[PDB]
RNA sequence: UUGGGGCCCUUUGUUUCUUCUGCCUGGAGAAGUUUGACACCAAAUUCAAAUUGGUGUUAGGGGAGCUGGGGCCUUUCAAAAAAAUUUUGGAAGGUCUUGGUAGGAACGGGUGGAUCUUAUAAUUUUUGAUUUAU
RNA sequence: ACCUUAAGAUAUCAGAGGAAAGUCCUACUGAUCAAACAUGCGCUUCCAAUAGUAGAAGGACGUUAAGCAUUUAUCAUUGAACUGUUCAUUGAAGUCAUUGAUGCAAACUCCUUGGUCACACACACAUACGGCGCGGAAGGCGUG
């Protein structure tokens, strides 16, 4: 019973082939070439199409890289807060869009005296652009309340979070 | 026989193909599996066109009548490489609603032996 | 011991043993001469090549053989 | 990731002898046995019959059925159906597992006899054969043994009868052997 | 350079893969065909089975199949001593790439 | 990828049929993932002349490589 | 793939293949690999014009293979059912 | 590792 | 880019399927394998006749397209109506798309404009 | 409950959901229905039982509730062309039908399998040596 | 004793919001696609005598059957006669078949398959034909 099972079936019988041998089995030889045409019939096709059409789906993708090209020398393209140098003054990052110049000058001088401040807005609007620049009257006072509103999860911005850190000036 | 417009080659599995091959020969098997697109068929049957026949399928009684050799074999897995084309010719033996009856039955019997396999092996 | 196909090619290059390399049919030529360099796909690069159809060939000069049509490579 | 799917064990994914050495072992070589012992059983056991379409048989159909006879039907109990069952489907295992082998006990001692019905020294499948009985070796010769019926052999097996049909033999022999 | 063009293909990295493919198609063989596209002139594109298709090339691809419209196929069938100019214009043709031999850009 | 199982026919005399006409014989010596193989004193059966000391065959022109031996 | 595996299956047991030349093999089936290699032991080989002859082994490249017929008990195995159960394999 | 091509690599690069 | 996504966009348009055989098949196009694994429907296979008297025709194609079971035994040409025929994607020669689409709008690769932007 | 007529019993292991009792002058009786039961296969201890390992079977019809969907009708509400008319949306009720009735939701991972992309157009399957050719 | 792993992703575009340039996400929102499940179309095709001993579809790896008609059965060397032909000898291979193969055609026998359903034994129809009984099979299309 290992394999009174499996009894396979009868042998194949045998038919004629009706193929090619796998000696003679071969693509097309004798491919002719490709200079005769050239001389008469391409006259022929260039006279009687003049112009191709227009190559239009190149357009959408020549046109996306402009974008690409058009966008980088642009924003490279350029050049109240000209203050004395950053050893004492104090900056601050990431602050509130709508936030004003008094509430970022008091809230410096919740830990830390101030003795001139200016708040830099973007040239669009008269919004503060989250930027506020404002002196200090001790540097090491200045340091270390910027250490501590960069530790303590950023400052707190109105609609933001706002870290601290050097002015990088 | 109709078949569905949206029907794969995972949609006609025990459905009575008809493959083509290279070299002018036919399978007439029920499928039951495929992957490379080499397929298995369950009772196909080769036949093809004998040489000194084929000389009356070219253009010219009224009807041709061919007589096709045909070889009986069974259970062959075929090679993707030589498959052709393939056609169906004829629909399972069971209906549809049949087969979805079986699937959830044979479903519902392999999750109970399942379950109680796992119950017995963990004890 | 067993020896590679790659490393059996490696010893003809290096022993410059003329080899008389059989392309396959209906093209129904054979390539005679010496083996300078061997690819990973069979592909050789041939000096002095000699043409023989299947005696009154021309020469060739040196030739990449494209490994594609190779069959035998026999000394 | 490959396991077998007889004996159920997930194998840490291989492709060489790994899977010719979980082939060739016990667990996977008797639990494939049983396994398609099972499902030949079935097909063997299989008793669905084809698919009933009655139809509605006429007068004059009917008239000529129903004039001739009725016919009564044998019945068995339960446990009577189940052992006539269990005795049917015993027969059927043996004698289908029966094969004769009378040619090759009654030329037991033939000359070439080592180098045909061994099958061990056979000429087309001796390459199987040639860890794990007194084999009969190719270099016999007929010398020995030069008169077989020197009480070497017995008598020839007498011909089997069915044993359902055993009170059909004749009572008595023609002749008084002893 | 010439270390990541040697360089194995399962070894650089995605972003590197898109920039061969994108050099290959600009500095390369298939250069010719993305020149014959852009500035429209006609190929004359010699088959495998002795067909010559005279068409222009609207997209192609790494395989060298490429899609082409005004085709118009060209092909001659013989036997023996007699021969026959047969020719047929398709508007708009997808072409498989295994089939092509030579490539020809009009001068 | 997987070494074809032939470590059973080193050393040992074979007959494979080069494409579909021509039928080598000689004796193996190694073999490749291809089945690329290389043979020594071949003899192209068809009287028959011999090949070389030392041929490769290309495993793409490969199709039978019986065994004329104990195996 | 299912039919790889179940030519992996097939093992032990006779089965027939044709070639791509023409010729047909059947014998016992010793080893096959992944890629349709197959090692046939007592092999019957019938060349394409009707000969027939006999050899001990034969190892056919599985490229130039056609197809393979094993025995039809080979229908119910368990690798040709759908829905399958799995023991949650291991870390 | 992809197609045996690589392989072929990894034998042929050491055997130059 | 790879025009097998292209030909994926057509997805019920009438095509002209040029086999590498010689035959041509003619019906609605259903979806495409990544491999170009052809499936139509509404199908009429035909064999072109070479026109010219001695040559005859391929032989192993006149088989192929009987043995499909849909030859019409009184047409006079090799034509078989049948549905659905599944093609394999490497016997495909050429396809004739038909005229009236728009190639401006199918051939945007979706997925090269997507990385360049991403570039 | 009893009798009569018709048709069926190949239901062939005489209803085939299982066991046990049982049947042709009859179509019947008891117990049971999924972490369970029942049938069968294989072994070795040197018959049987024992166990371990396997493959299956656990159904068909009708009804009550409970519930998913459609069609049609009524009422009520909102918007536009208004408390009279219509169309559109929603709630409730009636009628008819059609389907379901033991699992379902949420979370989770060094979970399985399908599909897709890339290695991969370089000898073993799909990026061409089977239109028989010069 | 041999074995311990290709890597990624899981509808798509467009619009609003949140973490200069991308980048991600939204039990967010439109449009397209795909799948499942319900549910419909005067949608399209198909579903076997009993008022009778039938028939339809597909087989036969069935018989008549050695049917009726054609056509096939090696190569080399040497000797002999002979005007290429016949007889013998050595060597080499050689699927079985000749009751075969191939061409044509017919009768017969038998297997599997099916609603062998219900109401009817009926004078219809030009816009050519109430497609206005219940189911089942297979597709096409639409809605939720």
Not at chain 1, 124 to 147: C, H, R, W
Not at chain 2, 69 to 98: A, F, H, M
Not at chain 4, 41 to 62: A, L, P, Q, V, Y
């Amino acid at each position: 019973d290992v394999s009174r099972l499996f009894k396979p079936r009868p042998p194949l019988s045998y038919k004629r082939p009706t193929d090619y041998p796998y000696a003679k089995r071969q693509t097309n030889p004798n491919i002719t070439g490709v200079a005769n045409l050239l001389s008469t019939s391409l006259k022929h096709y260039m006279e009687e199409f003049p112009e191709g059409s227009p190559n239009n789906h190149l357009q959408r993708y020549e046109d996306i890289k402009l974008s690409k090209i058009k966008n980088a020398q642009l924003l490279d393209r350029r050049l109240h807060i000209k203050d004395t140098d950053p050893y004492r003054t104090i900056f601050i990052g990431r602050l509130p869009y709508d936030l004003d110049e008094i509430e970022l000058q008091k809230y410096f001088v919740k830990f830390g005296e101030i003795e001139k401040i200016r708040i830099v807005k973007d040239k669009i609007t008269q919004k503060s652009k989250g930027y506020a620049f404002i002196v200090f009257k001790d540097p090491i006072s200045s340091k270390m309340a910027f250490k501590e509103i960069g530790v303590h999860r950023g400052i707190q911005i109105k609609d933001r979070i706002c870290i601290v850190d050097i002015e990088r000036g | 026989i109709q078949v569905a417009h949206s029907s794969r080659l995972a949609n006609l599995i025990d459905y009575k193909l008809r493959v083509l091959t290279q070299d002018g020969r036919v399978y007439i098997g029920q499928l039951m599996a495929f992957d490379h697109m080499n397929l298995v068929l369950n009772e196909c049957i080769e036949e093809r066109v004998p040489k000194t026949q084929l000389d009356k399928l070219r253009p010219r009684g009224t009807t041709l009548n061919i007589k096709v050799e045909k070889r009986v074999l069974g259970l062959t897995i075929l090679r993707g490489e030589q498959i052709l084309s393939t056609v169906v010719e004829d629909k399972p033996l069971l209906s549809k609603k049949e087969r979805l009856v079986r699937d959830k039955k044979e479903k519902k019997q392999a999750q109970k032996q399942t379950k109680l396999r796992k119950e017995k092996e963990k004890k | 011991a067993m020896v590679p196909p790659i490393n059996c090619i490696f010893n003809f290059l290096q022993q410059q043993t003329p080899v008389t390399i059989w392309l396959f049919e209906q093209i129904g030529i054979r390539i005679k001469g010496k083996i300078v360099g061997f690819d990973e796909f069979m592909n050789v690069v041939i000096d002095e090549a000699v043409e023989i159809p299947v005696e009154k060939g021309t020469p060739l000069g040196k030739i990449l053989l494209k490994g594609d049509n190779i069959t035998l490579i026999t000394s | 990731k490959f396991y077998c799917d007889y004996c159920d064990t997930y194998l840490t994914h291989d492709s060489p002898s790994v899977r010719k050495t979980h082939c060739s072992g016990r667990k996977h070589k008797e639990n494939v046995k049983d396994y398609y012992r099972n499902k030949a059983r079935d097909i063997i056991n299989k008793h669905n019959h084809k698919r009933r379409h009655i139809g509605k048989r006429g007068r004059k159909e009917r008239e000529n059925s129903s004039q001739n006879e009725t016919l009564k039907v044998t019945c068995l109990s339960n446990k009577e159906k189940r052992h006539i069952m269990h005795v049917k489907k015993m027969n059927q295992k043996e004698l289908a597992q029966t094969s004769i082998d009378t040619l090759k006990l009654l030329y037991d001692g033939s000359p070439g006899y080592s180098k045909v019905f061994v099958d061990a020294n056979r000429f087309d499948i001796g390459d199987l054969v040639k860890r794990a009985q007194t084999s009969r070796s190719r270099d016999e010769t007929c010398e020995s043994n030069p008169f077989p019926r020197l009480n070497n052999p017995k008598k020839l097996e007498p011909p089997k009868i069915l044993s359902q049909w055993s009170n059909t033999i004749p009572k008595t022999s023609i002749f008084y052997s002893v | 350079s010439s270390q990541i063009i040697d360089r194995p293909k399962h070894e650089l990295s995605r972003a590197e893969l898109e920039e061969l493919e994108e050099f290959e198609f600009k500095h390369g063989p298939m250069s010719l065909i993305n020149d014959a596209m852009v500035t429209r002139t006609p190929v004359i594109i010699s088959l495998r089975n002795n067909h010559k298709i005279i068409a222009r090339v609207k997209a192609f691809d790494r395989h060298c199949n490429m899609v082409l419209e005004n085709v118009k196929e060209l092909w001659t069938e013989k036997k023996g001593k007699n021969v026959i100019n047969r020719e047929r214009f398709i508007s708009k043709l997808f072409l498989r790439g295994d089939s092509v031999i030579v490539v020809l850009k009009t001068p | 990828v997987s070494t074809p199982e032939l470590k059973k026919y080193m050393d040992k005399k074979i007959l494979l049929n080069i494409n579909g006409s021509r039928k080598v014989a000689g004796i193996l010596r190694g073999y490749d993932i291809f089945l690329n193989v290389v043979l020594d004193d071949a003899m192209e059966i068809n009287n028959n002349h011999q090949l070389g000391l030392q041929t490769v065959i290309r495993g793409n022109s490969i199709i039978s490589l019986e065994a004329l031996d104990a195996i | 793939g299912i039919p790889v595996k179940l030519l992996n299956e097939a093992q032990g047991h006779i089965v027939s293949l044709e070639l791509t030349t023409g010729a047909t093999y059947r014998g016992k089936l010793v080893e096959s690999e992944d890629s349709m290699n197959v090692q046939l032991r007592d092999v019957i080989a019938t060349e394409p014009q009707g000969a027939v002859t006999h050899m001990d082994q034969i190892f056919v490249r599985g490229s130039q293979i056609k197809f393979i017929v094993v025995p039809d008990l080979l229908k119910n195995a368990p690798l040709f059912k759908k829905n399958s159960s799995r023991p949650m394999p291991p870390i | 590792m992809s197609t045996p091509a690589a392989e072929q690599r990894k034998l042929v690069e050491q055997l130059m | 880019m790879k025009l097998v996504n292209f030909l994926k966009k057509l997805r019920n348009e009438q095509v002209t399927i040029e086999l590498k055989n010689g035959t041509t098949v003619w019906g609605t196009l259903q979806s495409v394998s990544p491999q170009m694994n052809a499936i139509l429907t509404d199908v009429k296979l035909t064999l072109p006749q070479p026109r010219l008297n001695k040559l005859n025709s391929n032989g192993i194609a006149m088989a192929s397209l009987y043995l499909t079971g849909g030859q019409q035994p009184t047409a006079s040409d090799n034509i078989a109506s049948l549905q659905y025929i599944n093609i394999r994607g490497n016997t495909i020669r050429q396809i004739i798309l038909p005229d009236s689409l728009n190639l401006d709008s199918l051939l945007v690769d979706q997925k090269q404009l997507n990385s360049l932007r991403r570039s």
